[PDB]
Amino acid sequence: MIYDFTTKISRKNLGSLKWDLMYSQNPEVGNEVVPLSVADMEFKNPPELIEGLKKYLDETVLGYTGPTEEYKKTVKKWMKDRHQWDIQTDWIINTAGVVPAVFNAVREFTKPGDGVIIITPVYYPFFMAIKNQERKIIECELLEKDGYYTIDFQKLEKLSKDKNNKALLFCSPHNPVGRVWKKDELQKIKDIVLKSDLMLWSDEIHFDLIMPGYEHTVFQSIDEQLADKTITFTAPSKTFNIAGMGMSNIIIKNPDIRERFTKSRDATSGMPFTTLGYKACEICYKECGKWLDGCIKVIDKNQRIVKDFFEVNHPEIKAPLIEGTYLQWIDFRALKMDHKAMEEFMIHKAQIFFDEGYIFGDGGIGFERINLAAPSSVIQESLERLNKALKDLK
Amino acid sequence: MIYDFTTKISRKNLGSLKWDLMYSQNPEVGNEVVPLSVADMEFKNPPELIEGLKKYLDETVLGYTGPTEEYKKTVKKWMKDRHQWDIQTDWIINTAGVVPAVFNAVREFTKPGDGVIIITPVYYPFFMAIKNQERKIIECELLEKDGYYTIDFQKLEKLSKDKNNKALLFCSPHNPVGRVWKKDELQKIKDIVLKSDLMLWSDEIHFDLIMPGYEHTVFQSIDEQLADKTITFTAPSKTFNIAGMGMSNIIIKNPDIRERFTKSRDATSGMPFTTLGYKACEICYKECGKWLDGCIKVIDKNQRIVKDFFEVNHPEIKAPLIEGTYLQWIDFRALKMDHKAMEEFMIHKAQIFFDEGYIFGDGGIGFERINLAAPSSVIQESLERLNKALKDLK
Numbered sequence: 079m080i081y082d083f084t085t086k087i088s089r090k091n092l093g094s095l096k097w098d099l100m101y102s103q104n105p106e107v108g109n110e111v112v113p114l115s116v117a118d119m120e121f122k123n124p125p126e127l128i129e130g131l132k133k134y135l136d137e138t139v140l141g142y143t144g145p146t147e148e149y150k151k152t153v154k155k156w157m158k159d160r161h162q163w164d165i166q167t168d169w170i171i172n173t174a175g176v177v178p179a180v181f182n183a184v185r186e187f188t189k190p191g192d193g194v195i196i197i198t199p200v201y202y203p204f205f206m207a208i209k210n211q212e213r214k215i216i217e218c219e220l221l222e223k224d225g226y227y228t229i230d231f232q233k234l235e236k237l238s239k240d241k242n243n244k245a246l247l248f249c250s251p252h253n254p255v256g257r258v259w260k261k262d263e264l265q266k267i268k269d270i271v272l273k274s275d276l277m278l279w280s281d282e283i284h285f286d287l288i289m290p291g292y293e294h295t296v297f298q299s300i301d302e303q304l305a306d307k308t309i310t311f312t313a314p315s316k317t318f319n320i321a322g323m324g325m326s327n328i329i330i331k332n333p334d335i336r337e338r339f340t341k342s343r344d345a346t347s348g349m350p351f352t353t354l355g356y357k358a359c360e361i362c363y364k365e366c367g368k369w370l371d372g373c374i375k376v377i378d379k380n381q382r383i384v385k386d387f388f389e390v391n392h393p394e395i396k397a398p399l400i401e402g403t404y405l406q407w408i409d410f411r412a413l414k415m416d417h418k419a420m421e422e423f424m425i426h427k428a429q430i431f432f433d434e435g436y437i438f439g440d441g442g443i444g445f446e447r448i449n450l451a452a453p454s455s456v457i458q459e460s461l462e463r464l465n466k467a468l469k470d471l472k
Numbered sequence: 473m474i475y476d477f478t479t480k481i482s483r484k485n486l487g488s489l490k491w492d493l494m495y496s497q498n499p500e501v502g503n504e505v506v507p508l509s510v511a512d513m514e515f516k517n518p519p520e521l522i523e524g525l526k527k528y529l530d531e532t533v534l535g536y537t538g539p540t541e542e543y544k545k546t547v548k549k550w551m552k553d554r555h556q557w558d559i560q561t562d563w564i565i566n567t568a569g570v571v572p573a574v575f576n577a578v579r580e581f582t583k584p585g586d587g588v589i590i591i592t593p594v595y596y597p598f599f600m601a602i603k604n605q606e607r608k609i610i611e612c613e614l615l616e617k618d619g620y621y622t623i624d625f626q627k628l629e630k631l632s633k634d635k636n637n638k639a640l641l642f643c644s645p646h647n648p649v650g651r652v653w654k655k656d657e658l659q660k661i662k663d664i665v666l667k668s669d670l671m672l673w674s675d676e677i678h679f680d681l682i683m684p685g686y687e688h689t690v691f692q693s694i695d696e697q698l699a700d701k702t703i704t705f706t707a708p709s710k711t712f713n714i715a716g717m718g719m720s721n722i723i724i725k726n727p728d729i730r731e732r733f734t735k736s737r738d739a740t741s742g743m744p745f746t747t748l749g750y751k752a753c754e755i756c757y758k759e760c761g762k763w764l765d766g767c768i769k770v771i772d773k774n775q776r777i778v779k780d781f782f783e784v785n786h787p788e789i790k791a792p793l794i795e796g797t798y799l800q801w802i803d804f805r806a807l808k809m810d811h812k813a814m815e816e817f818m819i820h821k822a823q824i825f826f827d828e829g830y831i832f833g834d835g836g837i838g839f840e841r842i843n844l845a846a847p848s849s850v851i852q853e854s855l856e857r858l859n860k861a862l863k864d865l866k
């Protein structure tokens with residue numbers, strides 16, 4: 079199959095939440111502008127998936143649908159071959175998206191007033207899943223040194239000792255800083271977790287999007303006792319740009335926890351009957367491996383394009399390479415602009431639409447998250463607009 | 473076009489909930505057997521839909537997607553053209569299925585211990601939506617005389633006086649009895665509702681599947697004040713056999729009720745991001761009207777086959793014609809077999825898989841619901857199989 083990561087596509091007036099958001103923020107945005115905000119790709123989906131879905135549409139009946147044993151086997155096989163992770167078919171529980179699964183986790187395993195620990199700054203829906211259900215957000219801020227983010231273990235161990243805290247909501251790879259947790263880091267966290275009564279909710283939706291050289295370790299794969307009280311969220315959506323196919327594979331080893339998560343889901347959302355969602359995931363894992371390799375190559379090229387751009391044109395702004403995800407963390411703090419001013423400038427002066435750093439927590443103030451999943455030429459067009467805007471800003 | 477309502481299809485090992493349930497119940501079931509239980513059709517989807525979805529796939533990106541204004545106008549046009557019902561586009565709230573919407577209504581407009589009135593026997597998920605959320609199921613049993621079901625207005629009024637009951641969860645057309653409510657019946661229910669603090673939740677998922685000779689009336693369309701406190705559940709799933717596309721259109725006129733409903737949805741399932749869900753509904757409404765006409769004819773043709781079948785071979789068993797839906801209600805109380813025992817007989821001796829009447833409430837004990845949405849030849853095969861089983865039964 080021949081893949082395309084070069085065609086500049088347009089998603090204007092097509093129901094794209096990302097594009098509609100851009101036009102809503104700046105009605106005067108040029109027609110040549112492409113948003114680099116929300117985490118979905120500016121690439122057509124894998125050809126095999128599209129051809130596969132069309133083939134399926136000619137065979138199937140779009141009725142009440144559930145996962146086939148083959149589907150489960152395919153997900154189990156992906157975890158094995160791609161992550162040296164041994165799971166069983168009956169460990170897989172499906173939800174229409176990871177966020178709803180997270181909301182469900184909080185709903186079922188905690189009560190109002192209970193605390194949930196998250197490492198910040200981080201993917202904003204985490205905050206929502208907690209406080210929106212009246213639970214307490216317990217922040218364990220990341221330590222940062224010259225752009226490199228690490229875990230505050232002393233503080234984390236302290237928080238785990240607080241009986242009111244019922245679980246650790248973990249992001250791995252960690253959005254938006256692009257960290258792919260090292261084995262030693264995961265070991266320290268594992269010890270803290272097993273030492274307390276904390277449950278482990280590990281969101282590893284970005285675990286297939288790792289940059290060259292780095293290695294992802296499925297958290298619950300390093301210890302069976304840890305796995306006994308862990309809920310791991312996975313899905314093919316971020317990997318193959320199918321967030322609009324709504325299908326997630328939540329892995330839960332413990333029968334008691336699994337059955338509680340399922341009961342709760344069945345009272346809110348219910349079981350996913352989306353036939354194409356099941357098939358899309360199967361097709362991706364079975365046939366879209368080569369496409370993913372090519373996608374990662376382009377992303378790696380793009381993070382280097384960004385890094386180079388600032389080293390050459392505006393050295394005080396830092397865009398370090400990331401370890402995972404296709405979301406790069408750019409440090410604009412040297413501009414000495416508060417986050418509201420930055421946002422205003424990016425949207426109206428540079429017409430570059432990032433996911434403003436501050437939305438991920440106060441630790442993101444001064445930073446900008448750029449979506450690298452676009453053609454290199456598109457990234458270049460955007461940086462040049464920024465270039466002229468920054469120069470004008472003088 | 474050439475619409476196929478004759479090809480006997482097989483959905484074995486394809487993830488069909490209906491078929492898998494069948495095999496689970498009778499591993500020895502013959503390969504010639506087709507289930508007539510779960511409410512999805514044993515027909516392939518509308519040609520226009522399939523060609524439209526394939527075309528859409530060649531042009532779209534499967535990312536985070538929301539409804540377009542065109543989508544909304546199309547939903548509005550369908551209500552206007554097909555039901556003489558004037559709705560506004562901002563009245564439309566989307567969910568991934570009607571059942572989740574019902575759970576949402578119960579969770580947001582009532583509290584634990586509150587009562588929700590339902591007219592039984594009825595679609596079983598209704599019971600679950602209430603009971604599994606710690607709410608009280610308040611049954612208002614339908615009156616039955618020679619097969620025809622009517623509303624017990626006296627009981628409904630009595631129950632409406634209990635301030636603990638917060639709403640009436642209505643099914644129109646009514647599954648599983650097949651009643652399409654007359655304006656006279658709806659007006660009488662309305663007066664009872666308007667004189668109380670009862671909210672109205674009208675599940676009208678079957679309102680496009682009306683048999684010749686009858687006409688559905690959207691409940692909230694008969695009175696503006698009733699509409700002010702009514703939540704109407706609609707979707708294209710039952711109509712075009714796309715329960716596997718996960719897209720429902722919940723119509724809520726009142727701004728405050730709507731806002732609350734949406735808030736409740738966002739705290740549990742969030743909005744549907746399904747790209748194909750929105751497109752499938754728009755295609756069906758715009759291009760699949762003729763297919764639907766052909767489908768209803770076969771359903772009408774089949775219900776008459778069932779009716780005549782019993783009158784000729786087992787007249788003590790009654791299967792009267794229905795007014796709406798494609799689910800026919802059969803009275804098997806003349807066999808004097810307790811339900812659990814009768815189910816056993818149907819599953820193993822006759823190898824006919826109905827939706828056992830008792831599952832819809834005690835009022836269904838002794839009845840069987842047959843899915844008419846299948847090729848006429850398939851209905852005949854099934855009936856002939858039960859015929860032998862019945863005779864041998866003696």
Ligand SMILES: *Cc1c(COP(=O)(O)O)cnc(C)c1O
Nearest residue numbers: 175176177201253283313315321
């Ligand atoms: C994108 C993203 C999700 C995905 O939600 P889906 O609805 O399953 O696509 C969950 N977690 C993080 C950390 C993400 O960045």
Ligand SMILES: *Cc1c(COP(=O)(O)O)cnc(C)c1O
Nearest residue numbers: 569570571595643647675677715
């Ligand atoms: C089939 C049916 C539904 C459809 O539910 P979905 O969640 O949209 O599949 C809802 N209500 C009744 C009365 C039905 O018979």
